[PDB]
Design a protein around this ligand. Structure first.
Ligand code: DHY
Ligand code: CA
Ligand code: CL
Ligand code: CL
Ligand code: CL
Ligand code: FE2
Ligand code: FE2
Ligand code: FE2
Ligand code: FE2
Lengths: 360, 360, 356, 356
């Protein structure tokens, strides 16, 4: 069931700007994002923490909101002009979606804002106006050895990737890289507005769920330092996967889990995608260098676990089951297969993960 | 069982200096060590390749010798003076070990040398004299993105770690770190002469076998580049384990396998151990940050696979079985366990490895 | 002398894309750019070498063209669509500028291209069509310890910075950072299309001349390696300035000199500027942390030396003298002044450069 | 005949440089520099002293800041291998005719039995073995700073007659690794080691005795860059004296900075292994412009002429003896000096002038 291209013009989206995450214990979450990860506090009170990255000038990149059920409450994109908020509203209304408009914003530091239940069941916000704050990009007196310098992207779990992909292309995101097989199945797609590999991405699975939010560092050693620090704090069990080099994106990466199991990616040094004919790279799902370029196995939790998302009323969205093939199953499951070198049996894996591991 | 301390004085050992490895196909080994890893050729012909690291001034750190069966032929330590080779000869004769003395060396670029079949079945060489070559430490016109700058250590698999440790202590090696359990079994020990964490190390297991030879890089990014390069060359299947941060040693590391399955470690940034009261560090075998500080699982091959070693006639030394508990079995096997925080059930793994994998 | 805003719509410029440099000895230049700096050859013949950075997919980022006088021949920007090359043509005509349009390109690997002598006397090219090549961004088998990964920007020397700034703003470039004094003089401005600090910059001085072309590395150590390699090759005399951390741009940098003295910057880790209200940063010209954040002195040659530029016929553009104050003279000349802390005499410099 | 005769008494077995005691005039300002700016770790403090250690250290401290009226080095301390080596050090310096002081309970907190001496070159050396062990912070990445100082690496002493001091240090078991000489036979500097790095101390030709600097190492080059960046952000870039750079001698990445009393601190990383007894000694020509900074960056005159006072055992300032051998400053960057990039080549050489 294809999502039609509206007649109304798409809003001009600049970039991913922030996420609002609902958390169950604010103090424990603050300890994770401020004390462990070093994000900068823009505002806080008893109910909310507003956090930003080292180079950000908008009010925040992350809002932690106390609530009963941990979930993604909104993924927010900044648009180019105030008038793009009107465009967003008309666009989503034509798509048949629920929309909510607040002239004074939903969260502090954001002005006129539109939140929508998009056609994949995701809570998207579009805004232009935001309170500028001190841009800390040269505050080396604050710089941490693991400093998170920007918000980079979101990653969304959704059951039908081509359906979502077409809708995001209409909205103006261009696909930079994807994962497919020779039987017609799409497992994942990465798409951008701002000229990095992505602003959001679709990962095939039961959804809507939020796979992760990603922040970048300047250098690879900053990511290693996050791991080293987590060991020193004796919370290495909260390192889910990595560090590694991605095939898709070519970025150095790490996946870690917050106190409510919301997944955060730390990412650095992908490439420029701003040209309109930027070459799209398609990887085969059975290529064992596609997710970790060094062939390290992808733990099953990476495929199966992700965050609930909320509707505009704050209720959890119902999960829709993926009927397409499962990336986990076709690569590391019982009938799974992966290769190091296409057409070579040597360095291939049958019914198990790479490097001597099987599904727990 | 105990190896008695000789009356004769121990030779004064400076450091690990080189290893002679037998390889089955010299051209494929050359491609690995020179083309992929960038070691520098000191001499080569149809029978052998002599290699050194970027900062070395003695003739070589690695001798690749063509032969029928891939194996360790000699692990060589440089001693402080010519007279120390005579001391080594009297010491090992008093231990009742087979010795062989050659006034003009066993390999090119080494003069007066003593090879011995040591009490643990290992072929050790001791020498002083060596041919000096151009020290390439400032040849940044040659420097690779993955440059190996020094030879750091060896690691030996032996069935009885305390027996081996005591013998190495009598030789003047001082233990820096070890791994034990609460019921008094030792699984591994690291010991040094030069003022780093180790020059050699003992891993509990069936032996004698050589676990690995280790080279250093200057920085962590150099190790990441070795991985990246192996991905580009589509030999990621030869990355056995890593990259990571060690617990023991605190060094950043990677383990890779040469064309004959000889294991090479790439290592950087351990600490100073030259003071005679340098504090020892004992880890518990079930501490999941002891080998990889980030808790990443140790691949089973790391525990079970190792190189054959040769006796002084070039025949393979018979293997003696370990009867103490297995590190693999007590940590990641069906009956094993490991913890992130001592005492804490959260972040503990029972009957499987960390991060969600079981043994393949 | 104000350059009027045309009625015709400006072209939609994506980014700086390539420079064409005339060089006098193709072999010596090849050695510098390929052997020393490790740039990748897309094409080469007896008269020209076409080079690209590690992550590029268009044909080239740099064209070295043999000729009698070393100079900038074209600074090229890619536009979003084929129809934007028409927009660029109608725009520069209305500006009264000389233009030349070639459906098959001026250099190999570029299709329909427009060249112009712009109102500041610089040879700009606008194009969409380019021959795609193998993007080498994951070819870590080729990756050098000093690897240049992207083309980042150009920097132009021009006598009147406000004049040039207004023209580039009308053209769609937004100022990210600039250097001014409290007497109303502007010494420099940086401006962007692609969302880094700049695609081009204006440096106040006698012009038109090209100050430098800049390539990125992934990390700071890659720039260090470039220096270390130049010492090993015993060509450290071709390191002009750096390495350092910029005040303006916040980027780690190095300036070196090619065999014809064309200045090349290596640059890494500036910040994101793609929001349309990106805060502009204005530095005072006397702030000694503005160019080198660590306060290292800027050598006079950096201010006085720059490359000649050619007009559309291949002749050197005549240089027009700057009449506004000189950044060299007001900071490090005999009556110069700079400070470490605004208002503090301690750590200030009178009539000389910082650090002794 | 001015020679320092080798004693018949055996030399103490010296392991490494271990700590320095620096007298500072304003303890709070000094604490801000060493703790807040540089990130050293507090091992003990009170209203008179601050005891500080690096990230990987297990002995009590690497730096003792002592409040006093006149900023000076009070002691440069080396750890010896055994308690009996302190007895050896006493017999050895007594035979040299040096003034000595033995305190069985130490001179500073966390050190036990210790000997201080006014050595033949006028420097206050300490020899101890006994020290209180503390928590080794090597894996405390929860404390690790972007600019983390991980070890104490070395001292550098200014002395007028380098061969005279060098032979005295060789007798004490220090081995020269590198030096700087000219064709006429003058020695300008020498570096010498006990522990297996390029040096534990070094001698710089000049008026002495003065302490040139104390040096700490970082893990990687980016940690040094970060010190510079932090000092820029704190607007104290005027306290960055020289660097950052690649050294010729030692091949280490380096930075020189100045504490509140103008004590010079080097930050240093990635020299090479020197533990073999026939470690090749490297001699550089004083006119080689890559010997100090490998990239050819000039050495600011203050690096050659400024250094800290040292104290005698009563706490008074040691009188200075002026160098009569040729001055490295004068022969390289002074009115009659010169330096080269490539030996014998006028291109890239500097006459009566520093580089760049
Ligand atoms: O650059 C120089 O001045 C030579 C040099 C080398 C090593 C050092 O530790 C040092 O202080 C000085
Ligand atoms: Ca198939
Ligand atoms: Cl992935
Ligand atoms: Cl290990
Ligand atoms: Cl600048
Ligand atoms: Fe991601
Ligand atoms: Fe090892
Ligand atoms: Fe620039
Ligand atoms: Fe030094």
């Amino acid at each position: 069931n294809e999502i039609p291209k509206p007649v109304a013009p798409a809003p001009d989206i600049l970039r991913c700007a922030y996420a609002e995450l609902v958390v169950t214990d604010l103090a424990k979450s603050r300890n994770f994002y401020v004390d462990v990860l070093g994000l900068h506090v823009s505002y806080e009170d008893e109910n909310q923490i507003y956090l930003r990255s080292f180079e950000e000038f908008i009010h925040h990149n992350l809002v932690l909101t106390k609530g009963p059920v941990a979930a993604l409450k909104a993924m927010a994109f900044r648009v180019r002009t105030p008038e793009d908020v009107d465009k967003a509203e008309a666009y989503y209304q034509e798509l048949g979606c629920r929309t909510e408009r607040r002239k004074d914003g939903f969260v502090k530091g954001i002005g006129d804002a539109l939140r929508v239940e998009d056609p994949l069941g995701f809570p998207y916000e579009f805004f232009f106006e935001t309170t500028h704050v001190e841009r800390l990009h040269m505050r080396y007196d604050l710089y941490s050895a693991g400093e998170l310098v920007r918000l980079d992207h979101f990653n969304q779990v959704t059951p039908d990737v081509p359906r979502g992909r077409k809708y995001l292309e209409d909205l103006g995101f261009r696909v930079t890289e994807d994962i497919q097989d020779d039987e017609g199945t799409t497992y994942a797609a990465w798409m951008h507005r701002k000229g990095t590999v992505h602003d959001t991405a679709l990962t095939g699975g039961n959804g809507p769920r939020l796979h992760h939010v990603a922040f970048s560092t300047h250098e690879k050693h900053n990511i290693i330092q996050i791991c080293d620090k987590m060991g020193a704090l004796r919370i290495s069990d909260r390192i889910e996967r990595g560090p590694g080099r991605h095939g898709v994106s070519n970025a150095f990466y790490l996946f870690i889990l917050d106190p409510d199991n919301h997944r955060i990616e730390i990412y650095t040094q992908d490439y420029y995608t701003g040209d309109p004919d930027n070459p799209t790279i398609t990887w085969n799902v059975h290529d064992n260098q596609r997710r970790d370029w060094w062939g390290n196995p992808v733990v099953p939790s990476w495929y199966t676990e992700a965050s609930k998302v909320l509707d505009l009323d704050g209720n959890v969205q119902e999960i829709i089951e993926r009927t397409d093939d499962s990336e986990l199953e076709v690569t590391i499951g019982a009938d799974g297969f992966s290769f190091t070198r296409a057409g070579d049996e040597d360095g291939s894996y049958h019914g198990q993960a790479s490097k001597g591991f099987k599904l727990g």
